[PDB]
Amino acid sequence: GLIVDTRDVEERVHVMRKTELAPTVAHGVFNPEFGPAALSNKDPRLNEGVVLDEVIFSKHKGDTKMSAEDKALFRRCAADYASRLHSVLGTANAPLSIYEAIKGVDGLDAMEPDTAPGLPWALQGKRRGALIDFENGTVGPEVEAALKLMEKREYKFACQTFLKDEIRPMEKVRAGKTRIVDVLPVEHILYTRMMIGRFCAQMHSNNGPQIGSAVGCNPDVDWQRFGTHFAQYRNVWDVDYSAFDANHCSDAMNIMFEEVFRTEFGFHPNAEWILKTLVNTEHAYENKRITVEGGMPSGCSATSIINTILNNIYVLYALRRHYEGVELDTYTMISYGDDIVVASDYDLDFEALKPHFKSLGQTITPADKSDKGFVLGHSITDVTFLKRHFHMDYGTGFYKPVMASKTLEAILSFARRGTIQEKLISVAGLAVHSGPDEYRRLFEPFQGLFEIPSYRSLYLRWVNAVCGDAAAALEHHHH
Secondary structure: OEEEEEEEEEEEEOOOOOOOEEEOHHHHHHOOOEEEOOOOOOOOOOOOOOOHHHHHOOOOOOOOOOOHHHHHHHHHHHHHHHHHHHHHHOOOOOOOOHHHHHHOEOOEOOOOOOOOOOOOOOOOOOOHHHHEEOOOOEEOHHHHHHHHHHHOOOOOOOEEEEEOOOEEEHHHHHOOOOOEEEEOOHHHHHHHHHHHHHHHHHHHHOOEOOOOEOOOOOHHHHHHHHHHHHOOOOEEEEEEEOOOOOOOOHHHHHHHHHHHOOHHHOOOHHHHHHHHOOOEEEEEEEEEEEEEEOOOOOOOOOHHHHHHHHHHHHHHHHHHHHOOOOOOOOOEEEEEOOEEEEEEOOOOOOOOOHHHHHOOOOOEEEOOOOOOOOOOOOOHHHOEEOOEEEEEOOOOOOEEEEOOHHHHHHHHOEEEOOOHHHHHHHHHHHHHHHOHHHHHHHHHHHEOOEOOOOHHHHHHHHHHHHOHHHHHHOOOOOO
């Protein structure tokens, strides 16, 4: 995005905090090159010259204004992707009720009852529960008033810059590269969910290469589906972006919103409007208010869905800008936010696509980080997606999502106080795919102190999750 204005104000929105993360028993064993992100300028791990607010906004290095010809191309690509999308999903995209937006629906999780409420509620000392009844799914007079402003397109707001309390590579930590969550007002998240929540639910339920989206997928179940699909193609590429969310130009955002969320596809006219409020945003950090044009606010309502949609359009756009006769069946892909896997039987020159992605303000590089750059001949078993490899399970012959052991070691080395038992059960689900020996090694430091699921139990759970018929078939014959 482009920072167009920075000003100081009287009201201080508090940003600096103390980490809730602490080292676990595993930290001493694995000694990972990872640690909690700096949540304060006084953090002694920070490098000399690091000003935390300046580093977090350093990703905003302009809003790429596309040429008239390129915007016309982009719109055709957005409309072509939207056509595919709504053909698969249907047009049942009318607003959710207030109750449904709060409580959720099939394919859409309920709103968080006690997360940050955003501004100006944070300054007034009001929590989310003071504004919204999450049990009964009703809203108070303050939220009611705000919803009316959104109905009339008169609503204005500021984003609250929240430092993301998480583990990062130490090189990133010391450089002050703490990631942020742009906390929008709870009523804005509510209205966004009202306007596009039904669409988001359908996106989740129909995830796959046909719509090019892995949002709402279950890697345990879906790696078999994704792996078998991409295995059919001659070439497979996995692509890395740099600051994907920040570098979405206003042209691309506006055109996408205009073509995907049309009233003719069942949306209320304010679906486009509420999404367009994300383009030019004011961000509050302490006494500073920073106005940014372009870029997607990070960690907001439908951020993954929006980023995924743009990713699909970008690929179609880039290929059509370089080659003639490119259509949606020229290639296949699946995306989750900035993460992407692309495949084709054509020997597509992804190195040649670099300048075409640059015309969108995006910088693409191979995930392998090899010399020269992108190359042909790679397969599904070479790529990473959602930090997971596509490996073949010897026992079943199904694909399974395998995470790198260093990633798992880093995850296990830290935890929020009072959440370790819950985290270990969750991480055990990730680690089972590494095999019995690696599974045992990873959880050895926790044995005795916590309940660790048996490898056997999680393996059997997974076999049924991937293929119930296979699980049933294994019981046909007497041992």
